[PDB]
Design a protein around this ligand. Structure first.
Ligand SMILES: *[C@@H]1O[C@H](CO)[C@@H](O[C@@H]2O[C@H](CO)[C@@H](O[C@@H]3O[C@H](CO)[C@@H](O)[C@H](O)[C@@H]3O)[C@H](O)[C@H]2NC(C)=O)[C@H](O)[C@H]1NC(C)=O
Ligand SMILES: *[C@@H]1O[C@H](CO)[C@@H](O[C@@H]2O[C@H](CO)[C@@H](O[C@@H]3O[C@H](CO)[C@@H](O)[C@H](O)[C@@H]3O)[C@H](O)[C@H]2NC(C)=O)[C@H](O)[C@H]1NC(C)=O
Lengths: 50, 50
C-alpha cells in the first residue's frame, strides 16, 4: 500500500504483453540500528567483524 | 497499461468538470530503425530524400 514519504520498487512480469505484479513502497530513515545483512548469523555473540 | 521504464502522456477532456480519458505509456529506446514519419510513402523504393 502507499506509505507517506516512501520510494517505490515496481515488480514486472513478461509471460510469453507484460504486467505489473506489484508495487512495494519503502519507508525508511537512515542510521545504525537496523542492518540489511545477507543472512542470519549463527554462533554469534558479536555481529561485527573485520 | 503501465510499462516498465516508460513515460506517460495523459489525455484529458473538458465536457461542458474535466476528466482523464486515458494514460498512454511509452516505452522506447533510441536509434535509427523505426521512424515516426507523418504518413506512408507511395511509389517509394528509397524512403530517404534530400
Ligand atoms: C571490538 O572489540 C571487542 C572487544 O575486544 C571484540 O569482541 C571480542 O571478540 C572476540 C572474538 O570473537 C571474543 O573472543 C571470543 O570469546 C568467546 C567466549 O566469550 C569464545 O567462544 C571465542 O572462541 C572467542 O575467543 C571476545 O569475547 C570479544 N570480547 C568482548 C568483550 O566483546 C570485537 O570483536 C571487536 N569488534 C569487531 C569488529 O569484531
Ligand atoms: C543515396 O544514394 C542512392 C544511390 O545513388 C540514391 O538512390 C537513388 O535514387 C534515385 C532517385 O530516386 C533512383 O533513381 C530512380 O530509379 C528508378 C528505377 O529504379 C526510376 O523509376 C526513378 O525515376 C529514378 O530514376 C536510383 O535508382 C537510386 N539508386 C540506388 C541504387 O539506390 C538515394 O537517393 C540517396 N539517398 C537519398 C537521401 O535519397
Amino acid at each position: 500500500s502507499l506509505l507517506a514519504s516512501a520510494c517505490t520498487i515496481d515488480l514486472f512480469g513478461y509471460p510469453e504483453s507484460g504486467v505489473k505484479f506489484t508495487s512495494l513502497y519503502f519507508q525508511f530513515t537512515k542510521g545504525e540500528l537496523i542492518t540489511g545483512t545477507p543472512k542470519p548469523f549463527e554462533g554469534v555473540t558479536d555481529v561485527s567483524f573485520m
